[PDB]
Structure formats: structure tokens, C-alpha cells
Amino acid sequence: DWPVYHRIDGPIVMIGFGSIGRGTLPLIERHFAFDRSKLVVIDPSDEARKLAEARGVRFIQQAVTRDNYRELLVPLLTAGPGQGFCVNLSVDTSSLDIMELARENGALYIDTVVEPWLGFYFDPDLKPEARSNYALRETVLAARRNKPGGTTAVSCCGANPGMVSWFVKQALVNLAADLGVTGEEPTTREEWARLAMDLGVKGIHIAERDTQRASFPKPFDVFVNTWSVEGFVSEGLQPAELGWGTFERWMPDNARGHDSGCGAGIYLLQPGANTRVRSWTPTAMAQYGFLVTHNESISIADFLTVRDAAGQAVYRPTCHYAYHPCNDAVLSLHEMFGSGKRQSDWRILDETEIVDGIDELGVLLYGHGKNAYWYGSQLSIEETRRIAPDQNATGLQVSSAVLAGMVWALENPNAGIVEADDLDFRRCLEVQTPYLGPVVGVYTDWTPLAGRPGLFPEDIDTSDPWQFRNVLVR
Amino acid sequence: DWPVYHRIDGPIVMIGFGSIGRGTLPLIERHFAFDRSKLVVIDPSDEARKLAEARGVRFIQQAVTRDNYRELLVPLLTAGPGQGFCVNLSVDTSSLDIMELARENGALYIDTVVEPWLGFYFDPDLKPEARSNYALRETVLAARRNKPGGTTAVSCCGANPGMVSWFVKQALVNLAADLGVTGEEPTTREEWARLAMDLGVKGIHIAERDTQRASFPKPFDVFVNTWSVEGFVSEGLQPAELGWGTFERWMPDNARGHDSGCGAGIYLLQPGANTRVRSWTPTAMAQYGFLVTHNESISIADFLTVRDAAGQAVYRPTCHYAYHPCNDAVLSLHEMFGSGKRQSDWRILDETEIVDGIDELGVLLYGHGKNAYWYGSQLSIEETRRIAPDQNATGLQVSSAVLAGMVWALENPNAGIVEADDLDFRRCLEVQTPYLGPVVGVYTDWTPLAGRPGLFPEDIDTSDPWQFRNVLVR
Ligand SMILES: NC(=O)c1ccc[n+]([C@@H]2O[C@H](COP(=O)([O-])OP(=O)(O)OC[C@H]3O[C@@H](n4cnc5c(N)ncnc54)[C@H](O)[C@@H]3O)[C@@H](O)[C@H]2O)c1
Ligand SMILES: NC(=O)c1ccc[n+]([C@@H]2O[C@H](COP(=O)([O-])OP(=O)(O)OC[C@H]3O[C@@H](n4cnc5c(N)ncnc54)[C@H](O)[C@@H]3O)[C@@H](O)[C@H]2O)c1
């Protein structure tokens, strides 16, 4: 039967009960020991309230805001007898501020995104740079520098960001092994970074194809998705963003860097969900992905940076999302950008509404001796239904990653603010793998120059197929 | 009961029996008197053969080619008694060569496209300019100059090109009435061009939204459309192309003109089916269309050109396609361009497969005192099934236009080579309108600058919303 990993000795406060909350709650109940009355869910939605009442869980129907979060969360997280756990799966709330509050009060914390308080994403007085995930991530890095160590808080530990950081480490180990390179696997950041450099990894796509289909066709003027519509549109409207490799020799005219921070990122002055890149997955083969900004695009490139004695970067991989969402979400983006405004309505596909499909989610390492290697999960909706309730394949990859992060935080409770790249990737994947369906590594000889140039002139670099110049759809 | 317009006493030679041929044959049998035995269908496919045999129509299973078309077609065209009619609804055949052969033998001719002999659309030695619909149309204009008058041959008389020319004339008439512009209805090309100028029509979109949906979801690696997949992909991979208005102040860097010809066009060094434009239809409201090359983009702009004494163009409207095909076709394009190659299979949706939807097809006249005016057909699949067999709503708009052109040609059989713009639009709409469902004119305050600029800097022209600079998706 199911492993019980740990006792939680205090309140469990779940903030948000949308698609990921609904998928995560049963895993928390499944895999942790605690008094049922210790758990409470906070969400402003009536829909969420009715579901929570049906599950028999405590529910507080309230939006967490800048104005009320201290008054609301501090008593709940410190109810005792010991250390509680704040599980933040919301939108419109500040990850940074709630995280800092949890840490001040000795409660563990996990989220799946660096979310700002409501109002941030569409503030007209904000420059595009300030709306970037690079900038949000830097607030977390600064918080860590200001308060090193202390109670563990896990930032951005979903499927992506989150799990895919663990896939990158496993992929690097697999590439090395497949070359006949034997020896101790890296243990430090510097060793991982040098492994990527030594293997000649030029860059990484977070290469995803969602093939989940609904029993009903896409309705006119309804945005459809397999996870948060609000969250997807939000990130989709942020600037296109990528971790920027040292091998790159070209960037578009509307690309910009950053004055400060870890130094690993650029962004484009255009929305990521209307930016296309040429990419590849085992089931899709060659496909367009959208260049949607993601925390791990920066965090992985940062993690895998090799610096010289002077502190200058001598190696860093390119890293970015290449997202092909479900067909109805592709159509939803076409409708939204085509109308110049958000649809009147939206819906997230429930498992009962999905006829078939998978969420194929992995990391595509390219530029090395075997050209390209994809490593990740091919979780189907059929398998999902067999092993976890109240979610689709997309949800389960995320909720199981939150599970793994919670297990790691409980096992390593004095580690301070950490990213998915900081966790024991083997332990996390050990906890998560029961919920990931097939997990496979696949080589391909495909490159962004396959079939090019065609019948029109193209600005391409034939000496280096994986240059962003060739990947970006222009 | 249905009107029988004329008796056809000679052979009726239908070249091609795909989606449009299948929809047109029943209309021909319905609306003309002739012995069924004088009908002959020529198509290389087994599928076409089985369908023709089921209809009891003579069938020749041959591909018409540059090598055989004279030997194959001349005896069919001249079998008598009296004048034959060549109804050309094929792919991979030269419209020009077959047209000249019909004329040389005294047979009437109609088609729905200026198609080249097989090999042209992907000939690697052709310059982009030579692959343009402008260049193909010039071969027809040259033929007309070379042999003025003579037997009627109707070039490009489907739904679009074809019907939309008649919609432009009716729209201009409606606009004049609404804008209070006085004068007699134009009766010459020169008078039409002057009316468009006097109304201040800056440009015209062929503004289409197809909402037909199938009872099955789009299959992976299958291109799905409501009409010719081969024909759609061929034109989609031709350069983006537009009739170019005198009001335009900007063209993109990869835009090019023509050294010779009528002078009304430009093209872009990129495929039209992967080129988006901001447009509008009554059912879609604001939407993306694809800037797919079309004969009427050039023919309508050329037709509405006003010249001074020197022969210099002083007024010309912009004119181009702004096509939003059915959702499964939108997905098919994303798949094809994302993979960089055609799908391994394709299918055209049958009326028996379509669960609902319309083919909303009209002309959007803009820049005048009432901003924009859309005029056209909103034909539904439900209505289509009630009034015509063996076709969906897209098919019926095309087949009924072919019917109209055939009636016109019989009533005007010595008019020489003509385009849809040369036909009497009232007579043609009188024949076609019973098959068009609701035909409506709608005004809108929408412009391409609606909601712009937004979150990111945009290269827009704020002085004139309808500039191509604002329409083209960059
Ligand atoms: N790392 C990853 O892989 C990953 C994957 C999916 C989702 N996410 C993130 O997880 C979060 C949730 O995703 P989802 O699919 O569950 O979203 P969702 O849209 O389905 O649900 C969001 C929930 O948050 C609630 N909410 C809104 N304002 C709130 C407030 N002030 N306080 C508390 N709750 C509030 C809503 O009522 C809703 O029920 C999002 O922020 C999303 O970006 C991360
Ligand atoms: N103006 C318009 O509005 C409009 C609209 C639709 C279609 N069209 C055009 O009309 C034509 C037909 O469209 P469709 O939907 O019927 O196409 P389709 O693909 O369904 O059918 C094309 C037919 O042509 C046949 N064919 C191929 N090679 C041939 C040859 N060498 N000789 C004779 N026949 C041959 C095929 O076997 C097939 O049955 C296409 O060229 C298309 O572009 C125009």
C-alpha cells in the first residue's frame, strides 16, 4: 500500500484550492500522518468551498491579501503543537511575503511559482523588465541572502518549474553514462555545472506537449486549458524570457538583458505566449513551442554556470520553455491574441471531461555529441485516473512534485530558502516517480535546421544548428 | 421548384471531381437541361471514379498533364452538337493552357483558380516573384491582350476569388447610399474605381471565418480542412501577397513589388499561411486571419485602380485575404509549420461529419466615413444540407458561384477571357443568392489599433488605424 513518509506535527494550511490544490490534497492525506482537523484550506471561490465541504475538510472562504495575510495566516500556522506547513497553491498572492511570514513563524513553506500580489502583472507603471520572472526570482534570491539558513522554504516546486530541474540532473548523468564516462556523479553545484560544460551541452528546452482532449469541442469565446487559465494567461502575457547560453552568437533586436542579479537571463519585448520556437518531443516529434517565461529557464541556466577566477561566466547553457499546450489551449491563444483581449469565460478540463491524451513533459538537452536527448514523463490521463483522484495528467505531475518537495522539506527542515535545483534530485524523484507514468530518455538527430532553408530566404546559422537564431520563429 | 436557366446542347467536360466537383455536378444537373450522357468527368483517382459511377456519369480515369491535355481534351470539347462547356475544378493542371485550348475549339470555360501544371508550386529554381499569384494572373492578362474577344472563358469564379468581387460591387453601392454619395450606379470599370475613390475606401479585406466543426477531434499528423487540402497547402506556401493601396505609408523589409504587369500588387518573402493579419467579421468580431495569396487580392485592387492621363495610378485600394479557417485547419497549420513538413495524411470534412457551424465569407471595406463595413454570406451547414447535396457550407459557396458564372457565360458566350470582376454582378448574385443563406451588411467601429498599444512597445502608425503597418502581425 501507499508509503507514509512523515508525520506533520502542526497545522497544514493550503492556500488555494484550484486544479493543483484539488490534486495535492489527496496526496497529502495519502502520504503524511496528521490529525485530520489540522488541515485547513483557504480560497475565496464558492466552487472551491463546495468541493472542500464535500471532501470533509476545513475551509475558510477568504482571499489572502496584502492587507489581511498577517492577521489571517500567523494564527493558523502557529496553532501547534509543533511545526506546521504552508502549502501555497494560489494565484494573486505574494509568494515572497507569505514565504517570509511562514519562516518568521517557524512553519515550512512550499509553492510552485513566484507569484506577486494582485495588481502587479498588469500595472501600467511597470517596465517589461520589472514584470519578468528573472526580477521576481531575484526577490527570492535577495531574501535568501538577507536571511541565510533557518526554516526550509521551497520555491517553485511544481512540474515546471520544479520536477524538470531533477530531470536535468538525471539527464546529465545519463548522457555521461551513455558516452562511457564513468565516475562519481556530481554533488556540488559547481560539479553539475562543469559536467554540463564538459559534455558540451549548449542548451536545454523544457520541451512539453500536452495531448489531452475534451469530450466537447472548444466553445467560442471560452479559454480552455488543463491547468490555471488565469495563471497561464498571466505568464503568457509576461515578456518572453530565457536563460542565455554562452554559445549564442545572435539575439533579436528586441532582446534585453538585466543590470543586476545572477546574470543568466534575457527577455524579449513581446509576450511569450505569442512567441514561437522550434522544438521537439518524442510524441510530437518536431513542433512549435511557445516561449512562455518560466522560473526554471533562469534557475537552471544559473545553476549550470561555470565561472572563472575573476567571477566572469565562461560557460552557461541556454534554457527556456518550449510549450505546446493542449489543442484547445492552442486555439484559445489564437482567439485571445487575435481579439486583443481575454475571452469572456474560461474553463479548466476536468478528468471526467478528458477523452484521452498525455502530458509529455521533459528536458531536451542539445549541442552535445549525440545532438539531442529528451528525458521526462509521458503520463497519460488513463494512468492518472488509476493512481490519483481529482486531477488530470497535467495536475498530477504538479501535485506529485509538491508532494516530493514537502517530503524533502520535512526531511531537511533547516535548509533555508531553496529552489528545486537545491534539492536532493534522487530522493525527490524517488517520491515522485510512482505518479509520472513512463519516464524515458530518447535521443534524436532532429535539429532546428531540418528541412531548411525552404523556398524563402532565411537568416540561419548553418554552422551551429541549435543557435537561438535558428530556433526562434521570425 | 428550381429554375432551369438554359439548355446546354454540347458536351459538359468536368475536369476534377473532388470536393467542389462533387458539389457542382448536382447544381449543373439541377439548373441546366441536357442529356446526362453528354456529361464527362476526368479525374485520376479511384475515389472519384466510384462516386461518378454511382451517379451514372461517364468517367475517364486520367490525370490531365502538359503531355496529354491536347490529345485527351480536344475530342471531348468538340464532340458536339454545338458548344461544349469545360468546367475545370482540378488541382495540378494549367488553367491557362486548358482555357486557351477550350477557346481555340469554341468551348466555354470556367475555373476557380489560376492553377499551374504540376511541379510549379515547389520548383526550387523559381524566384519567389515567379511563384506569386500576381505572376500567374499576368499570364492570363497577357493571353487576353493577345486574343481579345472570342469565346467566353471565366477565370477564377468560385467563392473567393469569384463571388467576393460581386460582394465588393454591392458593398460599394450600399456604402454610397449610407454615406449619401450621389450619382448613378457605375457601369464601367472606370466608374467603379472612381466610386471607391470617392467613398474613400482605403482598403478591403476578404474577411472569412469558418466555424464548421467535425464530430471527431483533429487526429494527430492529419491535415484537416473543409475544402482542398492540397490546394490550401499550395497557396499557403506561396508568398504572402496583397493588392497594395495608394494610402499605404509603410511596407515591411521583406516586401517586394513587380517590375511589370498591372502594377497593383506586392508580396512578402514568407509563406502566407504562416502570416497573420488583424481583421474582423460579424461572428468572429476581432480575429487573426492568415494572409494567404488569392487572385482577387490583385484583381479587385487592379479593377478599382484610377489612373491619370499619364497612366499613373492615383488611387488603388489595399486588398487581401484575412482567412480564419475552421479550428481543425488552424491546428493543422500549426502542426505543419511546426513540424516543417506536410502531415502524412489529410482529409476534407464531409457534411456527414460536420456537427455545426457556418462559413462566414465577405468583404470588409474600410477607411471611409463609417470606418468599416462587412458585406457577405453567413451560410450554415444546416441550411446547406436543406438546399444542396454532397457538400458542406464552404463547398456550396464555391459551387453556387461556379453555377452563376456558367449561367453568365451562356448568356454572354462571346465575351473573351473574363474575371469575376468583369461579370454582371447583379445577374450573378441573382443566380447564387438562393445558396448563400443570410447575406448581410454590418458596420463596425473596430480598427486594427483597438486596445493598442498595450504592455509592450509596438511599431504602429497612430495617425491612421487601417495602415498595413498596424494590420500585419509582426
Ligand atoms: N510549477 C508548475 O508546474 C505549475 C504548474 C501549474 C500551476 N502552477 C501554479 O500553481 C498555481 C495554481 O494553479 P491552479 O491550476 O491550481 O490554478 P487555478 O486557477 O485553478 O486555481 C487558483 C486558485 O487560487 C484562488 N485564489 C485567487 N485569489 C486568491 C487569494 N487571494 N487567496 C487565496 N486563493 C486565491 C482561486 O480562487 C483558485 O481556486 C498557479 O499560481 C499556477 O501558476 C505551477
Ligand atoms: N475560388 C474559390 O473559392 C475556390 C474554393 C475552393 C476550391 N478552389 C479550387 O478548386 C480546385 C478544387 O478544389 P477541391 O476542393 O475540389 O479540391 P480536391 O483536392 O478536393 O479535389 C481535387 C481533384 O483534382 C483531381 N486531380 C488531381 N490531379 C489532376 C489532374 N492532373 N487532372 C485532373 N484532375 C486532377 C484530384 O484527383 C481531385 O479529385 C482547387 O484547385 C482549389 O484550389 C477554389
XYZ file of C-alpha atoms in Angstrom, chain A residues 121-122 128 131 209 213 217-220 237-239 268-271 274 276 283-284 286-288 290 324 327 330-331 334 337-339 455-457, chain B residues 121-122 124 128 131 209 213 217-218 220 237-239 268-271 274 276 283-284 286-288 290 324 327 330-331 334 337-339 455-457:
72
model
C 1.064 41.682 -13.687
C -0.966 44.420 -15.449
C 8.644 44.952 -19.056
C 7.379 42.116 -14.997
C 3.468 18.525 -25.470
C -8.541 16.328 -25.493
C -15.223 20.904 -28.850
C -13.707 24.250 -27.860
C -16.514 26.731 -27.183
C -16.386 30.126 -28.868
C 1.462 37.882 -21.238
C 4.751 38.359 -19.442
C 7.789 39.039 -21.670
C 12.159 39.871 -25.320
C 9.870 42.880 -25.602
C 6.923 40.711 -26.629
C 4.509 38.304 -24.906
C 2.662 34.750 -28.778
C 7.093 30.583 -31.129
C 5.429 12.022 -29.208
C 5.205 15.338 -31.069
C 9.215 18.412 -34.456
C 6.772 21.035 -33.158
C 6.332 24.689 -32.338
C 5.572 28.870 -27.096
C 2.883 23.051 -26.877
C -5.136 21.745 -28.723
C -3.584 26.489 -28.718
C -6.942 27.579 -30.162
C -5.122 32.151 -31.248
C -4.242 37.311 -29.187
C -6.392 37.544 -32.308
C -9.121 39.507 -30.491
C 11.702 28.239 -50.700
C 12.170 31.594 -48.937
C 15.343 33.385 -47.806
C 4.446 25.264 -56.734
C 7.650 23.658 -55.425
C 13.335 25.103 -56.463
C 9.650 33.932 -55.189
C 5.673 31.773 -57.647
C -14.370 32.911 -40.615
C -16.664 21.546 -36.630
C -11.417 15.647 -32.812
C -8.467 16.545 -35.035
C -2.542 13.785 -34.881
C 3.151 28.037 -49.077
C 3.137 30.648 -51.838
C 4.353 34.109 -50.738
C 6.310 39.167 -48.872
C 9.213 36.750 -48.725
C 7.371 34.412 -46.336
C 4.524 31.872 -46.643
C 2.097 31.447 -41.618
C -1.162 36.688 -39.629
C -19.455 36.385 -35.968
C -15.757 36.339 -35.061
C -11.808 40.861 -33.912
C -9.692 37.915 -35.114
C -6.451 36.821 -36.705
C -3.928 34.330 -42.466
C -9.587 32.228 -40.356
C -10.462 25.234 -35.977
C -5.900 26.252 -37.690
C -4.469 23.322 -35.725
C 0.254 24.989 -36.507
C 4.628 24.716 -39.946
C 5.750 23.494 -36.521
C 6.974 20.197 -37.982
C 2.013 46.095 -22.479
C 4.893 46.206 -24.965
C 6.252 48.773 -27.403
